[PDB]
Amino acid sequence: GSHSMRYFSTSVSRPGRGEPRFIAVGYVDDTQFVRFDSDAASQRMEPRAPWIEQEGPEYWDEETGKVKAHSQTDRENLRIALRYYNQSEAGSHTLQMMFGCDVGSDGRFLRGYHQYAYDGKDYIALKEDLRSWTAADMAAQITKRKWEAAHVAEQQRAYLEGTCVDGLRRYLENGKETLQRTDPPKTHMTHHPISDHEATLRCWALGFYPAEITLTWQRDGEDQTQDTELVETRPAGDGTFQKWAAVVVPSGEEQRYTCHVQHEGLPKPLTLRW
Amino acid sequence: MIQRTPKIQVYSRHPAENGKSNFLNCYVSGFHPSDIEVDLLKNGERIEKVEHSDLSFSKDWSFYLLYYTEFTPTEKDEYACRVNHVTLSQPKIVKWDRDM
Amino acid sequence: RYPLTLGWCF
């Protein structure tokens, strides 16, 4: 199927308390593979998956250089942002960045992304055509004018359609066994009396990958949303995810309800009944 | 800059089996800004060998982190997560339920 | 493959 590569970075100014903190992580699909922390003593792009360890010291030098340089650019960007908005140096501000590409199954380009948020809000983004920019506000108009004049979009598109998709293909091989794997949910159902009049029916999805999943409840083969709780899909800590869905059910009714479970790893959907 | 309080889940990597090796998890998501404090507790006392994943974020720019520690569950033992963050008036404590 | 960020100045 499709695959994605992403880099996520976060700069946080620390007013009165030294230089900004810079953390960047890289992901292929739902798996992390590298990290860099400005405060760490090693000062290098470190490996965060087994399949990236088979890379030469050229790789680790190039990537260290590039990430270390981006930290300085964003460090300066925070100073620029303050002045643009005339904001007190006393307050801490955050700058986040998303970068990456999507490929189809055949390995070809599908999509590219480059975008920035200032204090949790959209700041600037490369549009899908990868030729133009969306500024969020007057402050980002200034940035966007710079970037047009300098032709950042042309550089980014070339990287996005080439070096990124190539990089992605390459990664999907080196960790073929971690990355092209599909782990189906191990599913089950529990039951918790609340009153002698009501009960909680809880439907579980466990040790699955990738993270996308759908859990539904049904009363007599017909959908139900009333009195249902659906927690957020969560990391297990081993490269797999968990999720659960519950319904409050009046006593004696338990068997009118079914749980439905859809995941790429299931050859066929699952139906669970108490 | 709006600020988002974290959503918190405490739970184990595998279904609990008293006297067996497991990992205790606390997952904090949907929050902003990124500075957060997260402790795991055993019978009310902070647990020390606690590690965490690298800071990342979702589509809506909100942050998430996994905190995890290796542990052995028993019938008797109590566990909890304790989370503080700018948006929280006082630390929030979330008891571990082998079923949620 | 970390992006080339040289031109990303605000």
Side-chain angles (χ1 to χ4, degrees):
Chain A
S2 103
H3 299 268
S4 72
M5 166 159 74
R6 291 288 178 285
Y7 282 102
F8 296 119
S9 85
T10 303
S11 295
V12 180
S13 50
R14 281 181 292 200
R17 276 132 31 65
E19 273 199 61
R21 181 96 184 256
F22 178 98
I23 305 165
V25 289
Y27 278 87
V28 165
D29 294 320
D30 290 324
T31 331
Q32 177 175 0
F33 72 108
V34 285
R35 68 151 172 205
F36 178 79
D37 179 353
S38 86
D39 264 16
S42 86
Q43 286 302 128
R44 300 221 98 219
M45 187 80 104
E46 289 158 334
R48 295 291 284 170
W51 51 270
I52 210 62
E53 269 133 336
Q54 62 189 304
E55 289 282 344
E58 288 210 330
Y59 180 87
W60 301 102
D61 284 310
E62 291 166 4
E63 301 287 297
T64 302
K66 299 189 297 173
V67 74
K68 224 171 156 179
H70 180 213
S71 68
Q72 300 303 315
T73 305
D74 278 354
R75 169 172 164 214
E76 177 68 16
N77 286 347
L78 293 165
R79 279 156 33 93
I80 293 169
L82 285 188
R83 199 181 40 74
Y84 281 11
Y85 299 101
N86 196 239
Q87 292 176 327
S88 173
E89 251 166 40
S92 152
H93 296 78
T94 309
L95 193 61
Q96 286 158 276
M97 183 278 305
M98 162 165 91
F99 190 90
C101 54
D102 298 338
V103 292
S105 343
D106 55 7
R108 312 201 110 109
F109 180 79
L110 256 42
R111 186 137 190 203
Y113 309 91
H114 175 216
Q115 58 203 256
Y116 262 107
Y118 187 55
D119 295 327
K121 272 305 202 100
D122 276 356
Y123 179 81
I124 196 181
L126 196 53
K127 296 169 175 273
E128 185 184 15
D129 82 316
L130 311 180
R131 302 160 98 109
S132 34
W133 305 94
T134 299
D137 62 17
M138 286 295 105
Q141 223 89 306
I142 306 177
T143 293
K144 182 191 149 140
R145 265 185 274 116
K146 292 195 185 229
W147 291 16
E148 290 165 322
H151 285 234
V152 174
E154 276 174 340
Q155 177 195 220
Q156 295 312 312
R157 168 178 192 211
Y159 197 88
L160 283 162
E161 296 172 340
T163 307
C164 191
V165 336
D166 290 356
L168 185 41
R169 293 167 149 278
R170 181 197 169 80
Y171 290 147
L172 293 170
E173 166 70 29
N174 300 313
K176 188 176 181 161
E177 339 205 326
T178 321
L179 302 159
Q180 274 148 47
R181 94 173 185 274
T182 299
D183 297 339
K186 282 99 205 152
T187 63
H188 80 275
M189 219 183 105
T190 63
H191 175 246
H192 316 262
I194 304 197
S195 55
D196 21 39
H197 134 75
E198 275 174 319
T200 310
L201 279 183
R202 181 135 51 221
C203 180
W204 289 86
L206 291 176
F208 60 90
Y209 186 96
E212 148 81 310
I213 194 169
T214 314
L215 296 177
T216 326
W217 280 102
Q218 282 196 169
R219 193 185 97 284
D220 328 291
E222 187 202 25
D223 267 3
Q224 184 177 149
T225 277
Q226 282 167 229
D227 303 49
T228 91
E229 183 185 354
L230 184 68
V231 307
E232 209 216 311
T233 306
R234 63 198 197 192
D238 55 3
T240 75
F241 302 85
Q242 319 181 164
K243 199 187 189 59
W244 67 249
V247 271
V248 182
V249 157
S251 306
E253 309 271 299
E254 282 91 339
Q255 51 183 288
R256 305 212 285 113
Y257 297 77
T258 59
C259 188
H260 300 265
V261 194
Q262 316 166 251
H263 189 267
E264 143 177 49
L266 302 178
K268 225 150 85 269
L270 291 192
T271 293
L272 282 93
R273 189 176 230 105
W274 188 242
Chain B
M1 42 158 190
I2 315 99
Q3 312 192 311
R4 291 177 268 218
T5 196
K7 283 151 296 148
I8 307 162
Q9 288 183 76
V10 64
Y11 64 92
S12 65
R13 174 184 301 188
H14 310 284
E17 286 163 304
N18 299 0
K20 200 204 187 160
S21 64
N22 223 313
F23 288 91
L24 188 67
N25 288 341
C26 181
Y27 181 56
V28 287
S29 57
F31 70 86
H32 209 125
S34 51
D35 279 34
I36 196 143
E37 304 168 61
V38 167
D39 292 317
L40 309 184
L41 313 184
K42 180 166 152 204
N43 311 313
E45 293 175 2
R46 172 155 71 84
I47 298 168
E48 292 275 13
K49 291 64 204 76
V50 168
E51 293 175 323
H52 81 257
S53 62
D54 306 307
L55 186 72
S56 189
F57 55 87
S58 321
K59 255 173 206 56
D60 66 0
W61 302 109
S62 73
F63 291 100
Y64 65 87
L65 293 149
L66 191 48
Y67 287 77
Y68 63 90
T69 181
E70 191 176 273
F71 78 138
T72 273
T74 51
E75 197 231 311
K76 46 189 258 290
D77 279 316
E78 216 138 81
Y79 289 100
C81 194
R82 199 210 332 160
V83 181
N84 201 182
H85 183 268
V86 214
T87 55
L88 291 172
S89 290
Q90 51 175 29
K92 192 153 177 51
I93 300 163
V94 171
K95 289 158 157 306
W96 175 50
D97 189 342
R98 343 174 135 240
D99 229 309
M100 335 270 125
Chain C
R1 290 316 169 190
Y2 206 83
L4 276 24
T5 64
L6 207 189
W8 295 14
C9 176
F10 277 20

